[PDB]
Structure 1
Amino acid sequence: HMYHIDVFRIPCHSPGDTSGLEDLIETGRVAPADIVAVMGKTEGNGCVNDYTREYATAMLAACLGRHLQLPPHEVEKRVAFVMSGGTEGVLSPHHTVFARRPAIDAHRPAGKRLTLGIAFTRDFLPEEIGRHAQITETAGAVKRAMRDAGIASIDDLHFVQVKCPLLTPAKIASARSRGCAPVTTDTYESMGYSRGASALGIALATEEVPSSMLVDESVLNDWSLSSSLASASAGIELEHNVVIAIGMSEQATSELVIAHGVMSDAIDAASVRRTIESLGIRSDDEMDRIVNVFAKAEASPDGVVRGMRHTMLSDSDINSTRHARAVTGAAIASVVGHGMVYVSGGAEHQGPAGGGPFAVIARA
């Protein structure tokens, strides 16, 4: 459990575009075998009917499939693909590629360094989504993912991404057939439930929330319950949960570090700057020391942002997650100077209500 991690932010001209990656390989900058995870922003709506996420994975899988001489479906069990759709406003579509080599036992650098580990859960039944099963199964995956990562303590954990499923009418009907009712019948709303249960699963694992409180009823209801590390992204492309734990260990030799924080609301650029500061990035010229930023945005559920009304939860044309991503994307872009960042929407039990957790990865 000793690793050297490489992280690459590569642009996408479209969801299917793998040329950023074909390049990294062909120019010898990364080994296909070493790749353990990919975190994408794709330009679908990031809601229920977003097939850009699936599509991106298909092409990536098939690309690595050629190189490793494996079936694409095989590569997907090997590598953690997490595609978050919805690139609104200035958000620029891209992949963030993660490669893991054995602790290049060259020399361990002085301070701790970036490490990363992954994990999968079993498939879920429709009636399990947004509920106990998903919460507890996720928590278990988080622990496996930390172990995989070689993360000593919760202190050293800085970011937990989770891809999770959602409900379609077919799934709902399937659940019904078994005499069980799904957590909701609104497909869009199911994403929040899936995200929220998953996030509480993380909160559980991180001992940020005590096991006794995590009843089904508290999911989406109890705003107070949350993980300040959790980033949840729902999707139609999968029936299981995919977990990526990211943090710091002394065993790691990466030329990279990670710090995290929390946005109090969608427009809290301050927090982000503050965290970027904490990594010793002090001018706009040092911003390119940042590989990427990962953030959670949501529409403040009380209907207000810093006292003023917002329309994001009343807008029947544009879903709130879309508003939120656009908003936070803009805020963060204004700080780091561009829109190629990972912003995901719907921060249910992820940091403060109306806010979300975020993380920064910079050169050591």
Structure 2
Amino acid sequence: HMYHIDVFRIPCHSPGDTSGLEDLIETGRVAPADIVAVMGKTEGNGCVNDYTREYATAMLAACLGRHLQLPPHEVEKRVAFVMSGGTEGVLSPHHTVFARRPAIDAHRPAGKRLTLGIAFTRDFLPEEIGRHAQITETAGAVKRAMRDAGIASIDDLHFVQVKCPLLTPAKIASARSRGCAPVTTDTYESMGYSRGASALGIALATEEVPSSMLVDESVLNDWSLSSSLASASAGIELEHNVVIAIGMSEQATSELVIAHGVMSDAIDAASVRRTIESLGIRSDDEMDRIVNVFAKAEASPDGVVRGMRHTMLSDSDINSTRHARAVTGAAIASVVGHGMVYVSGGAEHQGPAGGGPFAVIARA
């Protein structure tokens, strides 16, 4: 488990745009076989009927398939594609590409460095979404993802991304015909449950939350249960969970590091600023050391932000997750200097209620 990790933030002109990826390959800066994960932001609505996520995944897989002479569906088992829809406000569509190579024969740098590991769960039944099966399978996958990363302990774990399913009317009907009530019948709300259960799965595996408290009924209810590392993103494009564990390792030789923090609420730019500082980034022009930022945002479920009412949860035209991404994307852009950052919405059991975990990847 001794790798070298490269990370590349590449712009997208549209969800299907693979041209930035083709550039890296054709300029020799990354080898197709080494790519193990892509975390993207696509300009669909980030909710149920957002197919930019699947479209982006399909084009990326096709692009890599050509080079590796593989069928796209094979590439999707080889590579963890995690596409988060919704690029509201200043959020600029893009992919973060993660490549993994066997460690440059160390000659080991003086500290721990960026490592990454991936894992998948089985497909879930509709009636399992938001519930115990999803929690337990996710926990399992988080641990396998850690092992794959060569992450010695929780202390060295800085970010757990999970892609998870959602419910459609067909899946709901399919569950019903087996005499099983799905966790909800509202497709929008199903995303929260899927994200929530998955996040609790991470909290389970990281021992941030004791197993005893993780009953189905605690999901979306018990705000106190949370992982300060979990980033969950739901999608119509898959029936299983995809897990990416990102952390630091003695065995990694990457010229990159990662640190994590928590935003106390959607506008907590200070915490981001602080975590960035903890990686020795001073001026505005030292920001070019940051490869990307990854953050969770949500509408504060009490209906208030710093004592003032918000309308993000009462807005029947624009779902709360869209407002949340717009808000947090702006707060972060004001710090790093632009909106080409990964901000994912709906942060149930991820960081504090109304806030969310984030991580930063930077040059060593």
Q: By the TM > 0.5 criterion, same fold? A: yes
Q: Deviations over 1:265-324 (max 9, x none)?
A: 000000000000000001001001000000000000000000000000000000000000
Secondary structure of 1:33's partner? Answer: helix
Q: Percent identity?
A: 100
1:23: Cα distance to partner? 0.3
1:115: Cα distance to partner? 0.1
Could you say what the CA RMSD is over the residues aligned between the two structures, in angstroms?
0.3
Separation of aligned partners in 1, 2:282 and 2:127: 49
Separation of aligned partners in 1, 2:286 and 2:25: 27
Moved over 6 A (4+): none
Q: Deviations over 1:159-183 (max 9, x none)?
A: 0000000000000000000000000
1:335: Cα distance to partner? 0.1
Secondary structure of 1:262's partner? Answer: strand
Separation of aligned partners in 1, 2:293 and 2:42: 16
Separation of aligned partners in 1, 2:22 and 2:123: 31
Secondary structure of 1:36's partner? Answer: strand
Separation of aligned partners in 1, 2:207 and 2:347: 19
1:61: Cα distance to partner? 0.1
1:36: Cα distance to partner? 0.2
1:59: Cα distance to partner? 0.2
1:105: Cα distance to partner? 1.2
Separation of aligned partners in 2, 1:230 and 1:210: 16
1:94: Cα distance to partner? 0.1
What does residue 159 of structure 2 align with?
159
Q: Deviations over 1:12-63 (max 9, x none)?
A: 0000000000000000000000000000000000000000000000000000
Matches within 5 A, 1:1-364: 1-364=1-364
Separation of aligned partners in 1, 2:118 and 2:5: 13
Q: Deviations over 1:207-253 (max 9, x none)?
A: 00000000000000000000000000000000000000000001100
Separation of aligned partners in 1, 2:334 and 2:212: 41
Separation of aligned partners in 2, 1:107 and 1:327: 44
Secondary structure of 1:63's partner? Answer: helix
1:106: Cα distance to partner? 4.0
Secondary structure of 2:33's partner? Answer: coil
Separation of aligned partners in 1, 2:142 and 2:129: 17
Separation of aligned partners in 2, 1:319 and 1:107: 51
1:327: Cα distance to partner? 0.1
Q: Deviations over 1:180-217 (max 9, x none)?
A: 00000000000000000000000000000000000000
Separation of aligned partners in 1, 2:287 and 2:331: 15
Q: How many residues matched?
A: 364
Separation of aligned partners in 2, 1:20 and 1:53: 17
TM-score normalized with structure 1 length: 1.00
Separation of aligned partners in 2, 1:324 and 1:107: 45
Separation of aligned partners in 1, 2:8 and 2:145: 21
Separation of aligned partners in 2, 1:65 and 1:187: 33
Secondary structure of 1:95's partner? Answer: strand
Secondary structure of 2:294's partner? Answer: strand
Secondary structure of 1:261's partner? Answer: strand
Separation of aligned partners in 2, 1:33 and 1:66: 11
Separation of aligned partners in 1, 2:278 and 2:209: 27
1:104: Cα distance to partner? 1.1
1:107: Cα distance to partner? 1.3
Secondary structure of 1:200's partner? Answer: helix
Any gaps of 5 or more consecutive residues in structure 1?
Answer: none
Any gaps of 5 or more consecutive residues in structure 2?
Answer: none
Separation of aligned partners in 1, 2:352 and 2:157: 19
Separation of aligned partners in 1, 2:39 and 2:104: 24
Q: Deviations over 1:138-175 (max 9, x none)?
A: 00000000000000000000000000000000000000
Separation of aligned partners in 2, 1:74 and 1:108: 34
Secondary structure of 1:279's partner? Answer: coil
Separation of aligned partners in 2, 1:106 and 1:23: 29
Secondary structure of 2:64's partner? Answer: helix
